Design a protein around this ligand. Structure first.
Ligand SMILES: Cc1cc(CCCCCCCOc2ccc(C3=NCCO3)cc2)on1
Ligand SMILES: Cc1cc(CCCCCCCOc2ccc(C3=NCCO3)cc2)on1
Lengths: 97, 245, 296, 48, 245, 245, 296, 49
């Protein structure tokens, strides 16, 4: 496992380090969207920051399941339940939870 | 029986009540040099307890804006202790390490440090900014000894390589909501049975804040990070006078 | 303990029923002796095409026959036999002066449907799996052999496609390249069945995108990515103008072939690659025509 | 996609915002075939 | 005991008293996907009776001048029934079919329809007549669903291939002096274990009058042709939300 | 090994690190219908994975004054997912459920929700206040589907029965100082082997705050409660067209 | 031959897991000797109500106990024991002058939820299966016994419901009728569990119609046809005016009872039959009330 | 934090079917990956320069 740049947005060169992690904070409603990304490995995007992503660039095709572990770095006192969802091919980016 | 641990070597004992297991570099415990792997024909010195112990070398302060630090290894432990001596008097040196980085905070604080071991950690310069100048990192930067050095461009580990992938190296994280220390046990790793502890650094210790330190105001803001390392299976050969560098 | 309809439920039978078996056919079927048959009830000659099966009437039941030991072989009508013949599939120009491919390099999209002879043959079947032997005959437009060094590089879909004669991709550190002088016999290479599907597909009735499918996108109907094998790039090996106009003819020969689902042979002229379009106004009959069914 | 099943809850005294770090790899059944060269990168200036 | 037949699947039963045997596509009954042929690691859904049944989708009128019609398959059955649903909710689909085309007339009528199954039936355009324009058949033509589409140049199956040879495909004829329905049983046929029921159509159903319908005036002139198909060994995997296309 | 748990069905997996064991309604795991218990002679559909999975249907906000909410069940899951479909196309339905209600807060928050399963939960009206009017609860109240409905007189469960006794029903509490979720596993319960998922609701899910939510000001005040249910051993028979109600 | 996930697929298990077994409980549990226990690790008294299970702490672990041989029976707390007691469920008037039921006949819809005592008892459980013994106590409004002949006829749903004292349905050719003089001891009869369901249902959360469910029809919510057993008709046996005002009290006693799914006991007053409505403004507490939790 | 990659199997994350994976891993070996000729040096021998 290597760090997946889900937050591949900042480019200020002084903010390159914040691509490595995305935020999550006290919401005021119900079922808000935190983050979203293509689950494709050899494609441009977050997967390029990974070791897997990089090795793929060297092979024309692949097969197999992928795993993405999400580590929470908030304080010990913070609670919370997130819903991570993988939507197979043909399924348009979900509009809600 | 997995979050608490005690490490005892020589006459030193480290205690921890929130550790997250122990990593063994490349899954291999430090060993002494085989008779068929060695070449130096002189019988080496194996001081054992006088050098295989826990030296608590440095402390850094973690701040809401810290970039990260590194320590080159073979070197870091020179000049300090009997280990230092055997490393200066002898040409050839060999040894594995038990690195224990510690840093605690409250349950109301938050943050996460990446602690990795990068073998043959060659440092690079920004090349004069534009990239036309062939500059080179100074002795003060490539071999900082204790005190380590602070990273200037952690995203690329000041060497043009993504830190995002630094985990293919023996690593461990110090997430404050989870633990308060990392423990890596690296074996001797070089393309030679022995080498000069002085001018060659087998690997560097990286400690980088990936998830920034943060806490509501009023909570103790001085959050230190302390490095404590211990050589293992130290062997020395090729005795001459003492040398600094 | 169970519910019966679950114990029976033949749902999950991975094996195909069959009904037909493959028999040895080294030679043509022999003809055994026949004699007159004047009897009611048995009518071989009578068939019912509606069923959908070809008439199974034997020569023997249609006329008194002699005995013939047919030792004629059927080896030449196998797939490897039929398809394993080199044929032209690609052509590439590297002219000195022009607008086609100057700069000394070319990127040919690997698509064998650009040449009518070879195309029609394969379009006989819907699916086809096989290895192939690619041969590259290079020379000037006059068929003249010249002392020039080329570099052919197979660029898998995803690899960086060369942008110039001196592009960095020509370092070919993982792509397989071939360096050849036009004076050396044609370069020849063995290519495996490289596809994510189990067989190449000559016809793909559907889209690949999965989106809206408007007018502007009907361009993709029939485009199956499991056949897009990438591009073939060639360049004169240098820094300066080639000095000679070149042409590379690409010949492909299939081997270790497996074919499935035979379909009707192309009836009309071909108009475009990977697209069965035909001239609407010039729809010619399949064959020749007479003046009347009662005369030759 | 990542949605909030409930909400990020915190007591008075803790940061009202924290981060998640994602790490990814391939499962045991992962394999690759037919190697080519990477596209992700290609230099510009020639190595001095 | 060969002209009469009964087909029963799910909760549907078709009766016929003038059929001419049953054709089994490429001589192979529809099967489920083997464990070594599959790749999708998730356990699939096999609704069985809720989707493996006889959907009587359409009726066309045969006229003394009809050209012929076709229906692309995987698709034709979407939006209709529980099958439709499983095809929209799931990415991957797999299934064989039992196609029963029926059309009757009197002993005083005459005609003959060719009923074939053409796998990977790619449609082509007239290329703007002259052949200089690279036109492409529209979504409304390549995936007409039920209602099918009418052929414009049957002689070439609107795809530049002779219909004269269309019989190398699982076919059956509906000669009015002989029968009143065709029955083909096609197995799942693709170069993949599963594929999207939505954007890929495994094969088309062709129904073309080769010998024109005809009858002396005064005999009922409305001669319909009805399509009735039934999925077999339907399997679905890759569940997400519902998708139309 | 009792406070942490993982529930996996279909392609859905729920994780919990503060759960308080799992309740199994009336001590009976959901089963399929026996051959001697059934009457419907048609072979049913058992979609398995396409319908037996975790649908996370709703979220409510718990407030220092919330009265409580309920969801009628068979129904709640209609219109949503493949389950919904099979429930509309088929007359007869049968299935058990794995209900997982979740709601977390901090160690500085406090409160306690009662989570019960009340079979045949018939709703009643206040009878026009005085009790002379024979009013009846509206479709919008007796079959609210997802979104559930809020109780107006929780003390009597809007049906003239003491909530003080609601615990003789498969229940579990969500005490914030103890856990952060409830998990009930109800089997199919009716006086019939199958019934219409549409007009009959086997039981209701009650979620009532018995000990009011409270916390000193400054702590995140948005405390949601999310319902996540999963059908088990779903069976459907009596296939017709699709029906909404 | 199979696909594995089909060989495993536990789909179709007709047997219920259980987890709990029924044990013999003829007497109350005995108390075995207890002694002081001063030890760390074992805490009986500590429980977690959140789990959802009742505390399993034994008297023995809460105090030093003696030994008691509990021979008290539990027979009186069985279902047959509890429910098999005759109770009033229906009442019928046959007055001389009035508007209730003149003409000398009455049609009582068989619904036992019209009398609060009996109703509350059964509404303890959701489902209930059982046979019953119906008894009919008839007399005048003064409790005076009179020489009158009645006819009670059970009219199943579908049978023709009598429209008059001299209706044709009183021929009772297949319906079961009972002829009794008010001077004879009350008529009594044994009734089987007659229902298309497996158990009567006191609460049915849903509708029976299957239609639109507008406002005007909310009348049917909670109406379960598997409990509509038909009507009970009674009439003075004659052609002319009864001559005496009558009243029939219907007492039902259950037997061979099976009950399932216990639910909370009725907390508020009852307002209507087959409808749990309650007085919105007069919602009284379940029990009594004090002035403070710190005083009696 | 431990420093080890998640060992969670597809099987414990969703109900799975049975798949006989016969895909090879030969092309991902070192000899396989590295044994491909590539340009490493270039040398000029010009007439004028
Ligand atoms: C050395 C070297 C070798 C090469 C060329 C390798 C080519 C391998 C080609 C395999 C082609 O398989 C095909 C299958 C289908 C189609 C097709 N075109 C229209 C849709 O189907 C074309 C090619 O380049 N350099
Ligand atoms: C002779 C003779 C005997 C009789 C009367 C037979 C009565 C049999 C009655 C069985 C009643 O079972 C019931 C079950 C449920 C309910 C009910 N009311 C509200 C919903 O549930 C009422 C009766 O009449 N004549």
């Amino acid at each position: 496992e290597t760090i997946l740049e889900v937050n591949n947005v900042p480019t200020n060169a002084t903010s390159l380090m914040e691509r490595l992690r995305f935020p999550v904070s006290a919401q005021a409603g119900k079922g808000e969207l935190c983050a979203v990304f293509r689950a494709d490995p050899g494609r441009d995007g977050p997967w390029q920051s990974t070791m897997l992503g990089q090795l793929c660039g060297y092979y024309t095709q692949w097969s197999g399941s992928l795993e993405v572990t999400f580590m929470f770095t908030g304080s010990f006192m913070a609670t919370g339940k997130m819903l991570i969802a993988y939507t197979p091919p043909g399924g348009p980016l979900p509009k809600d939870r | 029986s997995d979050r608490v641990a005690q490490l005892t070597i020589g006459n030193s004992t480290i205690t921890t009540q929130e550790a997250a297991n122990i990593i063994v570099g490349y899954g291999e415990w430090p060993s002494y040099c085989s008779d068929d792997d060695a070449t130096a024909v002189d019988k080496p010195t194996r001081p054992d307890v006088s050098v295989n112990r826990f030296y608590t070398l440095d402390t850094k302060l973690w701040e809401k804006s810290s970039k990260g630090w590194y320590w080159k290894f073979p070197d870091v432990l020179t000049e300090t202790g009997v280990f230092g001596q055997n490393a200066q008097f002898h040409y050839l040196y060999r040894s594995g390490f038990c690195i224990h980085v510690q840093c605690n905070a409250s349950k109301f604080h938050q943050g996460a440090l990446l602690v990795a071991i990068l073998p043959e950690y060659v440092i690079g310069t920004v090349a004069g900014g534009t990239g036309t100048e062939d500059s080179h990192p100074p002795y003060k930067q490539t071999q900082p000894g204790a005190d380590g050095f602070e990273l200037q461009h952690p995203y690329v580990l000041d060497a043009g390589i993504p830190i995002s992938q630094l985990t293919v190296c023996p690593h461990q994280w110090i997430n404050l909501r989870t633990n308060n220390c990392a423990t890596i046990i690296v074996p001797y790793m070089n393309t030679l049975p022995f080498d000069s502890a002085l001018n060659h650094c087998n690997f560097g210790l990286l400690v980088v804040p990936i998830s920034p330190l943060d806490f509501d105001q009023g909570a103790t803001p001085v959050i230190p990070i302390t490095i404590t390392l211990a050589p293992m299976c130290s062997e020395f050969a090729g005795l001459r006078q003492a040398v600094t560098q | 303990d169970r519910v019966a309809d679950v114990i029976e439920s033949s749902i999950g039978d991975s094996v195909s029923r069959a009904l037909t078996q493959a028999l040895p056919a080294p030679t043509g079927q022999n003809t055994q002796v026949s004699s007159h048959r004047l009897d009611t009830g048995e009518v071989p000659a009578l068939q019912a095409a509606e069923i959908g099966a070809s008439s199974n009437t034997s020569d023997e039941s249609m006329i008194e026959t002699r005995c013939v030991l047919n030792s004629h072989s059927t080896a030449e009508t196998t797939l490897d036999s039929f398809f394993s013949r080199a044929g032209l599939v690609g052509e590439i120009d590297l002219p000195l002066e022009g607008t086609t491919n100057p700069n000394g390099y070319a990127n040919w999209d690997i698509d064998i449907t650009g040449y009518a002879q070879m195309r029609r043959k394969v379009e006989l079947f819907t699916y086809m799996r096989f290895d192939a032997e690619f041969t590259f005959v290079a020379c000037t437009p006059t068929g003249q052999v010249v002392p020039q060094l080329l570099q052919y590089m197979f660029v898998p879909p995803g690899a960086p496609k060369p942008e110039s004669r001196e592009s960095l991709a020509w370092q070919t550190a993982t792509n397989p390249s071939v360096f050849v002088k036009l004076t050396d016999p044609p370069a020849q290479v063995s290519v495996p069945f490289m596809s994510p599907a189990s067989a190449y597909q000559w016809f793909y009735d559907g889209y690949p995108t999965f989106g809206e499918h408007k007018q502007e996108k009907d361009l993709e109907y029939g485009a199956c990515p499991n056949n897009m094998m990438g591009t073939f790039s060639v360049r004169n090996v240098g820094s300066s103008k080639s000095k000679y106009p070149l042409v590379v003819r690409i010949y492909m020969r299939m081997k270790h072939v497996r074919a499935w689902i035979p379909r009707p042979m192309r009836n009309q002229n071909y108009l475009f690659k990977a697209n069965p379009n035909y001239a609407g106004n010039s729809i010619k009959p399949t064959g020749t025509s007479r003046t009347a069914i009662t005369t030759l | 996609s990542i949605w909030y099943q409930t909400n990020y809850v915190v007591p008075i005294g803790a940061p009202n915002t924290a981060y998640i770090i994602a790490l990814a790899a391939a499962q045991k059944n992962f394999t690759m075939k037919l190697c080519k060269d990477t596209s992700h990168i290609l230099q510009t200036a020639s190595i001095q």
